[PDB]
């Protein structure tokens, strides 16, 4: 029983941090076989940060303008390039703790675990989700650029995400390991602002599914509702539309737990219309949007609390 | 600028985790040089529960009744103990990924990170608090126990909890690496049940400190109170009393942000009589009492 915000196992990224350093500036990098990567704003200058010229400053960079450090072992570096907005340094060494690895991309909506690092070294890990926004609610300081969000499957880790920057909002932004940005943003200085957010309704009623597998029922109820009755509600409440693919997603957790979705968006409906009355759910007061379907499954009894 | 619930990096201790068979129980153990550290009811049946005698289950067991599976590698036992509640099987051959560590057994309202395990291999991590009465909030299912938590100071795993048991209310209980239970609680079956539970304090007022370091300011207010004043609202709420070295190891964070301890309590008070009308504090609708005053520090630096 339980259902807490769970990260992967961290082990087999922590062995892939390194420290890039460039002039003055040092962040994290992430080190692959004979590759390193890492945010390509570690060459700018706090001359340039207004409107920097990437192509520019990387063709007036040398291999010696780049010292990354794994540990206490110097690496040479033998190679640079950019892709998007990471930077790509070819290094002498293959990393012998590379593990089986994927780019992938993730949605808005989706979850990963962040190992947050600092100077090459990781200090922590934590669950995050990919906002409709496509900022993360990080944690975060500085020194932080060049940390990485995963996911685990089987002994695979999906690299999603690498840190680029914060937010005047305190959330934070970055790029996929193809150096594509999440979202409309750019790493140089504007006035960039997160845009507005909604709330992820599929994993909301994934959440009260996992409620129900560890015995918090007080919020069911005998009413059903049509999908577009609740998108409705939806709508007004600044929560995501449904669909048919989410209601099919949930089929697993309305089987496990014998609630039909159209029952549990009901049992939503009157959460957003009536509060909690002093109330929780699970341990929070408030509806919870950062676990995905999957996650739910992951981490609870394959079998209900009856 | 955020504040998450972190766990402390788990890459030096997975290398540590292994799969104990004894008869047909499996289960996780802790393999530090060449001992592995596991629950002892590890050697119990389905029929002796109720009042199992450990030193007659042991003694009538030898090494090759214990098989230790590091990974795909099978670990040859070579010995076996019991300390306290865990049993300690030496084994031929020393775990070449041992860190540096200790065995220390934590306070309640103190935190730590759990490596949840499954088979011998972790499935994921997540930070905890021990609680005033002994039990943690853990997520295990069947084939948890001998998951352990831990902290990290430097380059040493500080190891504190082995999972035992799940109790009725879905809460954990579990043994210090030493087999000595946190809190009233044994390995047999019994109605036992956690006790009576308190909200930690301190963690509430670090937390506070926490949410105005982030810019979360809406519940501040001019007023102060003294800290007898501010102890009998506590308790009337079933909070911990507040002790001068409770505001004390406050002081750090009360001079980074220019809020006294006294004034943080003053709107602790007013939270509590009052509520939050709708709003919320680092994402939350609810006082948070899991993160100690180094947690706060640790991740609040800026
Ligand atoms: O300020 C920095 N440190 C030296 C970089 C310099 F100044 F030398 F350039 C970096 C680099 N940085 C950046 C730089 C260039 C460009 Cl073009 C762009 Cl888009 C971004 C973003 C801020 N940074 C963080 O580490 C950071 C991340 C975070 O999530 N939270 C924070 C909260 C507070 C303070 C810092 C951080
Ligand atoms: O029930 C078990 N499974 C093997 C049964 C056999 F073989 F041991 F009999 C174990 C062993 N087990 C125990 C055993 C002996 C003794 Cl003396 C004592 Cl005090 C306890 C406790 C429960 N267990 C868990 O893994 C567990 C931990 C958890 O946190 N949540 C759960 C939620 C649901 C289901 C299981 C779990």
Redesign the interface.
């Given at each position: 029983?339980?259902?807490?915000?769970?990260?992967?196992?961290?082990?087999?990224v922590?062995?892939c941090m390194v420290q890039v350093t460039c002039g003055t500036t040092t962040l994290n990098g992430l080190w692959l076989d004979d590759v390193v990567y890492c945010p390509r704003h570690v060459i700018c200058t706090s001359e340039d940060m207004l409107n920097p010229n990437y192509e520019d400053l990387l063709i007036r960079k040398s291999n010696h303008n780049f010292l990354v450090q794994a540990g206490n072992v110097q690496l040479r570096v033998i190679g640079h390039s950019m892709q998007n907005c990471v930077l790509k340094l070819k290094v002498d060494t293959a990393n012998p703790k590379t593990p089986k690895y994927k780019f992938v991309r993730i949605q808005p909506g989706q979850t990963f675990s962040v190992?947050?690092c600092y100077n090459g070294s990781?200090?922590?890990?934590?669950?995050?989700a990919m906002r409709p926004n496509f900022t993360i609610?990080?944690?975060?300081?500085?020194g932080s650029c060049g940390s990485v969000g995963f996911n685990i499957d089987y002994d695979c880790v999906s690299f999603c995400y690498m840190h680029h920057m914060?937010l005047p909002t305190?959330?934070?932004a970055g790029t996929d390991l193809e150096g594509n940005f999440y979202g409309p943003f750019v790493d140089r200085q504007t006035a960039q602002a997160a845009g507005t957010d909604t709330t992820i309704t599929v994993n909301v009623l994934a959440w009260l599914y996992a409620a129900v597998i560890?015995?918090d029922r007080w919020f069911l109820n005998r009413f059903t509702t049509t999908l577009n009755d609740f998108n409705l509600v939806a709508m007004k409440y600044n929560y995501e539309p449904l669909t048919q693919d989410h209601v099919d997603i949930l089929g697993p957790l309305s089987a496990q737990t014998g609630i039909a979705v159209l029952d549990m968006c009901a049992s939503l409906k009157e959460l957003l219309q009536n509060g909690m009355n002093g109330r929780?759910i699970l341990?929070?007061?408030?509806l919870e949007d950062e676990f995905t379907p999957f996650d739910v499954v992951?981490?609870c009894?394959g079998v209900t609390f009856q």
């Open positions: 029983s339980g259902f807490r915000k769970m990260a992967f196992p961290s082990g087999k922590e062995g190992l947050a990781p200090s922590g890990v934590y669950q995050c609610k990080g944690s975060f300081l500085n914060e305190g959330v934070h560890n015995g929780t341990g929070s007061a408030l992951r981490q009894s």
